[PDB]
Design a protein around this motif. Sequence first.
Motif, short mmCIF file in Angstrom:
data_model
loop_
_atom_site.label_atom_id
_atom_site.label_comp_id
_atom_site.label_asym_id
_atom_site.label_seq_id
_atom_site.Cartn_x
_atom_site.Cartn_y
_atom_site.Cartn_z
N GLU A 61 0.77 -1.25 -0.02
CA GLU A 61 0.00 0.02 -0.01
C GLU A 61 0.87 1.40 0.08
O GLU A 61 0.50 2.29 -0.71
N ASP A 62 2.06 1.02 0.57
CA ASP A 62 2.70 2.60 0.72
C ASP A 62 3.40 2.75 -0.50
O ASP A 62 3.42 3.61 -1.18
N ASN A 63 4.20 1.61 -1.05
CA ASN A 63 4.91 1.85 -2.49
C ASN A 63 4.27 0.51 -3.18
O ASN A 63 5.09 -0.43 -2.87
N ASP A 64 4.01 0.68 -4.42
CA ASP A 64 3.81 -0.59 -5.23
C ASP A 64 4.46 -0.80 -6.35
O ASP A 64 4.49 -1.68 -7.31
N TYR A 65 5.80 0.04 -6.29
CA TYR A 65 6.52 0.15 -7.50
C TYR A 65 7.75 -1.00 -7.63
O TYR A 65 8.40 -1.11 -6.56
N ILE A 66 7.83 -1.48 -8.68
CA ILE A 66 8.87 -2.34 -8.99
C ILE A 66 9.29 -2.04 -10.62
O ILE A 66 8.53 -1.84 -11.41
N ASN A 67 10.69 -2.14 -10.73
CA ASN A 67 11.15 -1.83 -12.24
C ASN A 67 10.88 -3.27 -12.90
O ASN A 67 11.58 -4.05 -13.08
N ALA A 68 9.69 -3.47 -13.46
CA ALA A 68 9.14 -4.87 -14.12
C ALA A 68 8.08 -4.50 -15.18
O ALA A 68 7.09 -3.70 -14.47
N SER A 69 7.95 -5.11 -16.21
CA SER A 69 7.05 -4.76 -17.20
C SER A 69 6.27 -6.29 -17.35
O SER A 69 7.07 -7.19 -17.63
N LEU A 70 4.92 -6.24 -17.69
CA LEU A 70 4.35 -7.40 -18.33
C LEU A 70 4.23 -7.25 -20.03
O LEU A 70 3.64 -6.36 -20.30
N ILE A 71 4.95 -8.22 -20.59
CA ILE A 71 4.75 -8.43 -21.95
C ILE A 71 3.79 -9.38 -22.28
O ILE A 71 3.96 -10.77 -22.02
N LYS A 72 2.62 -9.08 -22.93
CA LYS A 72 1.51 -9.85 -23.41
C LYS A 72 1.61 -10.22 -24.72
O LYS A 72 1.25 -9.37 -25.63
#
Length: 284
Positions: A61-72
């Motif tokens: 809840e505080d920080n939902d960030y990660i350097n990651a992408s979903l490729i579909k």
Amino acid sequence: EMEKEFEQIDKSGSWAAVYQDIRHEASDFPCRVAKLPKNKNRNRYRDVSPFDHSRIKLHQEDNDYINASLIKMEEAQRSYILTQGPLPNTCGHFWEMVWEQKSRGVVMLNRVMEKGSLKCAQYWPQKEEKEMIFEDTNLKLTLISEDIKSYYTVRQLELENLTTQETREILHFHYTTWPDFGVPESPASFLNFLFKVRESGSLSPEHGPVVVHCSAGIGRSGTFCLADTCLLLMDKRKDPSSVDIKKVLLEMRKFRMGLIQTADQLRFSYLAVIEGAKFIMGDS
Ligand SMILES: [Mg+2]
């Protein structure tokens, strides 16, 4: 046809020119979450960010960030998460992502040290008896077994959600012989690696998307996904020479910037697909 196109570009030595056409035509979408100052230390490289539309969100809840992408890849029926090598402070986020997304495999295409600098944190345990605990995300990770081979290492890991006391088995596929500079001389060991990932079930749809990474999550990681998707489309389609590597790469770049970082990597991806076409157009 694709072998033809390879011959024409190689004899011309115009790989660099092809590679630039792809750069100019590549999508650009906002990366606002990634550039927030609260997330500066969640990013390994300042110029490699996930687009906001395809970014993986942590269920914090505080920080939902990660350097990651979903490729579909919707025709191929394949999904991949591409991410950077974890940082000392993002190892817990990384395993949280793996847990939340129900992934069954992690593909690692770099060594922890390359060119005398650290490219990734050591985010898995090295001995059975020394498990790792990620206090921030409440996860325990244990090395179950380790099978070292010449070009790659496969590890079985147990991930335990300490909150719920559930456990899952994760497979870690670690390609260890990508050269420090350039690309492999031949795609043979890369293709053999890719088919071991496939054989494990980690790419299949009963599971969450596989997590693929290198150091930035765009170069070698892009080569891996591009080759897997191309080869899958050749299986599926009525016309196997209707697959355009350049088109596929541009569709994937809608989901994460910069996939395939050099013209050498582009050349190599052609090579891997062309060679791989032999072992799926019917070579039992
Ligand atoms: Mg021992």
